Amino acid sequence: YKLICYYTSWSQYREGDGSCFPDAIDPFLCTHVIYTFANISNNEIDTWEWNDVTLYDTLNTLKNRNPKLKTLLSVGGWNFGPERFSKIASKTQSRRTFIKSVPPFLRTHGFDGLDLAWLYPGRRDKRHLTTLVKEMKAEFIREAQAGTEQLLLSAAVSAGKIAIDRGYDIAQISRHLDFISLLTYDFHGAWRQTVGHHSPLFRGNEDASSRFSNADYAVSYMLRLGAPANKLVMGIPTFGRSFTLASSKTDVGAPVSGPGIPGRFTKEKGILAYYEICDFLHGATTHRFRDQQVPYATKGNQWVAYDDQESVKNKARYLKNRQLAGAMVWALDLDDFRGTFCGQNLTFPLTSAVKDVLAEA
């Protein structure tokens, strides 16, 4: 099985214990670590943070300890606007410029591949994404002739049915990608004025939005569209999502007034790192959505949907049972990488739980 793990370049800036640099990563934890994100400038791949060349080096020094570890560089993300991707991919010339720029940059910086994180292709982009993936793969095939192991090509893909239908030719891109990471953790609609879980494995008992907004639906749909199981990797989050409650009610359908207050370290309303959630749990009441097989917790006027050791193990068993290629974790810097917040004196408790289950049989 693959265990694909993202590290985000902006996590270095977090205050105190929130600060995460690539040398915090256990070299034997994941099979693939993906650094996010690279920029595209002058139609060519490029660095983003002022110190990316240094951090790339810190990440790739992990291979000294684990020579089998593979690293990839992810281009795109939400800061990079999807409009920028569309412009590049939609013209033969700009597409070529971008593709040609990729292998030399990856080789210079010691990466084993490229991950495409276009968030997200629209209806007008579907055919252009197919050509980008096919042509990029063709370039990697050419570059391998020069003697070095062929660069890998992956993509992070929406797990939402509507977004999938709108923007991706799954049958075609699956042929050329070495793996597809499904973003199976963005299932709670931003329009919803009630609490709800963003990463449920199965649908909930009543009033769900779509019997589509769950990981099992997304996995089945991708297989149905022609992605081979051995190309699909199921995403598992190490962050949770938070809401401010609008009333004393906390169970299914509880009204909310907006996102939860920011975490002390991650400082973004509506999201919390797992290490922040571990602390939040002190004094909180814990519940589990039976049917959806994922937990939530609440205290005060705050309500948090999240994944714990039990839920990530459960998802790992699920993806093995569906004979998928493995799991993807977003993100290492949001797990308890220090090992000091979750009361087990264990680094990367969520990611390690997934790893341990993948090894079982």
Ligand X SMILES: *[C@@H]1O[C@H](CO)[C@@H](O[C@@H]2O[C@H](CO)[C@@H](O[C@@H]3O[C@H](CO[C@H]4O[C@H](CO)[C@@H](O)[C@H](O)[C@@H]4O)[C@@H](O[C@H]4O[C@H](CO)[C@@H](O)[C@H](O)[C@@H]4O)[C@H](O)[C@@H]3O)[C@H](O)[C@H]2NC(C)=O)[C@H](O)[C@H]1NC(C)=O
Under rule CB under 6 A, residue 37 binds ligand X: no
Under rule CB under 6 A, residue 205 binds ligand X: no
Smallest distance from ligand X to CB 39, Å: 4
CA distance 339 to 347: 4
- Token pair 């680094």 is found at 347
Return the number of the residue (41 or 61) whose C-beta is nearest ligand X: 41
Under rule CB under 6 A, residue 48 binds ligand X: yes
Count of residues binding ligand X (CB under 6 A)?
A: 3
Cβ contact 285:251 at 8 Å? no
DSSP SS3 for 106: helix
Q: Quote the tokens at residue 112.
A: 């084993």
The H or E element containing residue 272 is strand 271-273
Return the number of the residue (41 or 210) whose C-beta is nearest ligand X: 41
Return the number of the residue (85 or 140) whose C-beta is nearest ligand X: 85
Q: Quote the tokens at residue 204.
A: 């909930």
Return the number of the residue (88 or 342) whose C-beta is nearest ligand X: 88
Smallest distance from ligand X to CB 37, Å: 10
Q: Quote the tokens at residue 80.
A: 């990079």
Smallest distance from ligand X to CB 47, Å: 7
Q: Figure out which of the listed residues 13, 41, 193, 344 binds ligand X, where binding follows CB under 6 A.
A: 41
Residues whose CB is less than 8 angstroms from the CB of residue 315 and which lie 6 or more positions away in sequence, other chains included:
201, 215, 234, 236, 307, 327, 354
Pairing of strands 271-273, 239-245: antiparallel
Q: Quote the tokens at residue 240.
A: 């949770």
Cβ contact 34:75 at 8 Å? no
Residue with smallest beta-carbon separation from ligand X: 41
Return the number of the residue (39 or 309) whose C-beta is nearest ligand X: 39
**Which residues does the annotation place in the binding site?**
49-50, 76-79, 120, 183-186, 241, 330
**Which residues does the annotation place in the binding site for chitin?**
49-50, 76-79, 120, 183-186, 241, 330
